[model samples]
Target chain A: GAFMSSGPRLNTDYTSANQDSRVQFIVLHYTSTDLPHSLGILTHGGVSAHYLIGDDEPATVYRLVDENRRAWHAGVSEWQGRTWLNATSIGIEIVNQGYRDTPQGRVWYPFSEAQIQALIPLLKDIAKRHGITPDRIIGHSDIAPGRKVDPGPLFPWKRLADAGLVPWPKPGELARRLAELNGQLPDVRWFQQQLARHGYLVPQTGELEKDTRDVIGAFQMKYRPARFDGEPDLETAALLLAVPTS
Target chain B: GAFMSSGPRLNTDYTSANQDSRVQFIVLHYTSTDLPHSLGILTHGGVSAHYLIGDDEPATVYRLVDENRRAWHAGVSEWQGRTWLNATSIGIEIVNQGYRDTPQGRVWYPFSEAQIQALIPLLKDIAKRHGITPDRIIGHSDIAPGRKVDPGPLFPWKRLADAGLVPWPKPGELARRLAELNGQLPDVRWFQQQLARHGYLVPQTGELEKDTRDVIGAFQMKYRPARFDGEPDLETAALLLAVPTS
Candidate 1:
């Protein structure tokens, strides 16, 4: 009844468990639309994802595309020697209208308790099934900084970190690094090198170019989201040093 | 001593002249470095361009890469329907200390009169050789927004337009259109559609997402750089309507 046998399977007795998982990362996004509209776009439109969690009363999570097949979600993406992550990761599109434009400023919406509760289990299950490491759980902005900025600053990354699904900076180490600096941040080249070591494609040109600022902005959106103006500030440098490099 | 004979020549009267130019566009960039340093990077570094105009009394323009061969410039770019514009476009890098950091503000430096004077003839020669149209002349920011903001807002696009080498917005029509709005601007969808039609790769979704704002910001950096805060306004709308589509 199947079209063909599902590729090769390893022998239980002989093969070592040292091989890397086929799935290595779990990238996140916000649909920026309601449940019905998000379904319409993800299903009918050319773009798609592996899962879509709604913000309804009981928070429905729809599995649009299968985890085995590649979704057209990640476009021109790169992370940790991996390019075009659609083949090696699962994409989750949460049905939260990302932000609204107002006269005062951009008003970003936070995820509802129900929506986030539904997401935590879903993320844990996906992580367990794929053997995805905690560090590999990232946002779409992390991979494609210039093209995307979704699952934005208000997306509750700390909650995911608390759930052991993602990595968070060490607050104690950050405080220590901040004191040593004495309000003096490191040079531009140092920032670029450290940020690149942490898997951002930052420019090493010593000048704070727009691309470098974009990478910094993406980093701040995840690490220190209170102010993500992309400037090289003292707190940002401390957090950059605090995050795990390996 | 050379390799063999060069490529074949077109048979006169048999070849069709209806096809578009193999070289369709010319994208500009500011080296953000002085002449000596820019030369070091362009030659030793893996990245390069077809020309680099210096900033001296009489600006010197260096031809690093042959026009017939593709240069290492214009990475991850798009224009009209062509993605990755390096194959179909010629990149021109200008040597000017792009900006000065001051206690007051950003303080972008203007192009030298000699440099712009040198560029006009170079652009003319390239356009004549490649059959490039007026609308095909763009800056690095126009093609690779978010990642690039070089040949920045002060690059004197109007000078290129004055030389009949690039398109300019019609001021008379823009004034008329601005008056018709009566302090009311068009919706997000309309702005998105027009900007996409004008080769901006904007989102068609009616919502004012961050990506849409980025595209608008890029458009403003070119057309209305005085106050390109990425916010939609009446002047931006008028200029967006006034620019020639083709």
Candidate 2:
């Protein structure tokens, strides 16, 4: 269905200085539920997203909220200088159970190859359609650190990095840092600057406050989950130095 | 730290016959964010849970809310015949980034062994203290169905089942179904009954409704990730038949 307007049109020769697709950033998320519930919540739960990707075989990709319309998935969300992100971003919710806790442990779920294969084409097509840049292609976590962390660590950011859909810390630069680092982790100040440069929402207070530690943990959880303690560690620092900030 | 009461003493020698631990159900969920943010949301986002298990080594289990007090984790939730679960359940949130979305595909994260090992003792302690039965220990999805699906599929249900902390479809019975006379699959009514008997909140309308399908999918995602279409398939039916109803 399409809307029709009867207002008179103004034909002018004046051109604007800048113009692009209304959509700029592509934010990813895990539905944390199956497809039906995912759809139910997104469509009727007052919190909606543009698309929902199913993990079942012949993985189905559904378009729920239209691209032109804003989805409510991102709440109190931001990216770069953007605030309250729903207006400028297209949110994609993938159907996954997410994880559960056992008496012995916490377990996380994995996305399927079928789901991923289905998503790649959809992502590329959207990027081509909207001209969204690589850096703008981010997860809900990136936009709302300390608040949101969907599309978590196991998500292969490197896959997108390889596809040139999302940027990564440069391998050559990481190699350089690896060679020079020799286990000498950078100080807190350097980390603050680097994390800020990388667009993580962190205060440059130099003191290790709870907020700063959380932002650092967020960074490490993505790049190095083996020991993402929010402490100044060598591998984490190297990743900060090697990965492009932009 | 504990709160001290200043007044209102009953001073009764005889104990009341109908008294038990306020906590009865242990509903599990993944924080779906890195630790810091996970902490931030539960503490300050006006949403709170009793326990939060971190993914770092020497996995720190932070008790955010008191077990006796209700936390706001499960919202509009129900299990069996109960409703509004937050009051009766002790929630455990695990810090996990969950999953990532890319044009390349969907990916789910795994919980570290550290988190799991830490959780085991915690679960046992909680279960013992609250007298929560194995069936009472459930996932967020189990209570909310299409609304919530955290503590996802990859969460090792078998791990709990092995410990007799949770139930599984009877292996021998499933084997019997697998070795059946032929491919005479049970109808939708039978599946609905079996699923209901297995404790899944499914409708028994004889026809496969979307909700019924989703509940079936949620069940399959847990038991049979190979195929869970919510349809009355052979394996799903067999598993339904084979699994314990109690």
Candidate 3:
């Protein structure tokens, strides 16, 4: 069969001044499996990510989808009033056995040092290119609280903060806030508002719902990491106040 | 300060056989505004589509995002078992007024003849490249249901059907099925199963809930546009049965 090109004509002469990069955020996730399975699932299935960092000896970084292309990593997610994050964010999946239930309760796996080392540079490059702020670099749980909790508590967020890739609540400010509150935790509405301000899609029902608790749990997992029972506490509130929105 | 090129080393040495193209569906929508506003919103804001067809004399086609890239057109959507459709589909936005309520009734604008003429070839080209079947070439409402109802009833779906770009229920089969049913509508569970089989993300509540009705309404809006109130009836069931799943 003779194939005549029926594609639309190209006219690249005009450029719009209003246009900007589609990428605004960087969402992180864990594969909950090893490199081979992660590669298979990400590459073959309906799910995908822009990059996948392996946990092998050398810690290979695979670009499953190009940065310019959309990846299906962030499913039914939101952050900073931006719903359906896959369109406006680049997704990075790291290889880690997410969590396992044992006699000692559910034990989460830690990301390999090499994997984090590989990830830091990648995150920096993407951030620098897209002008993505440190606060926008968030975990899967931050976007899809209660449903998704990948790149969990064991994943070292502090290292990212230390590398200036993500924001860390100022220690002094956190302590001051903790003391100022004086064990009097803010109301659920206040927590919900703070979470929303910090770009979490938390509920504003004013009542302590599971959705609100889940967002708090995700926040604690990143900042406090001591107890992430989804309960609002003094330290969590302090961390919420201390974290920079800019 | 010198730039130290701290980017991760990418190894393209291996190729996975399990991989396939991320593009599985083509979701069509209406901008609900004019060309310039469409361009501004799609280019500057958090929303986007791969292609936009302007309703003008010449009917200009704008490529806002590359086909390889994901556009933020389908928000909080599902088709078949695929949730968050922006990741796995190409989005095409047509400029239309959508619907407006006046004293008479809600009025929806129709697509220009030239606009649709431009669309047919483009749809053919994309379908050829991606192996996207007729059934997978769906409207935005098909994916999002209650949350979205774009490319509304006035859009020329039959034109796409005539051009073999989208599926249309066979007239003979539809009539046969209608006669066979003989004014007896299938139960809610059966309708839900059929809708699911035909790739709608409907609830299996079996109680004719609003979500299920919305899905049915979306389906009816495509197939039987005369009355799409979402209430289950004989003709809708016949149309559903006649519509090819393949």
Tell me, by lDDT, which candidate is best.
Answer: 3
Name the weakest run of 10 consecutive residues (lDDT summed) in model 2 chain A: A8-17
Tens digits of lDDT, candidate 2, B9-120: 2212222122234455788898879877876787764677778887878787777665545577777765655555665678888888766788975466777778777777
lDDT of each: 0.77, 0.72, 0.83
Which lDDT tens digits does candidate 2 get at residues A1-246? Answer: 797523212112221222235466899999888776776676667777777787778677777765665567777765664555665678888888776789987677888887777777778888998888887888887777777667776777777777778778765777788778886777788888888777677878788888788778888867776765678777788888777755
Residue lDDT tens for model 1, A2-32:
5766422211221111222345678999989
> TM-score of candidate 3's chain B against its reference?
0.92
**What lDDT score is found at residue B191 in candidate 3?**
92
In model 1, which runs have C-alpha deviations exceeding 4 angstroms?
A1-246, B1-20, B100-103
Separate clash counts for every candidate: 0, 16, 0
What are the models' TM-scores?
0.48, 0.48, 0.70
Tell me, by DockQ, which candidate is best: 3
Pairwise TM-score winner, candidates 1 and 3:
3
Interface RMSD of each: 23.8, 28.5, 5.5
Across A44-88, the per-residue lDDT of candidate 3 in tens digits comes to 777888888888877898887767666787878877766677756
Q: What digit string (tens of lDDT, one per residue) describes model 3 on residues B1-246?
A: 287766458865443333335577899999889877877777765788888888787788887777766577887877766666776788888988789999987888888899998899999989998788898899999988878888888877989989998878765999999899998878999999999998888989898989899999999888887778899999889988898877
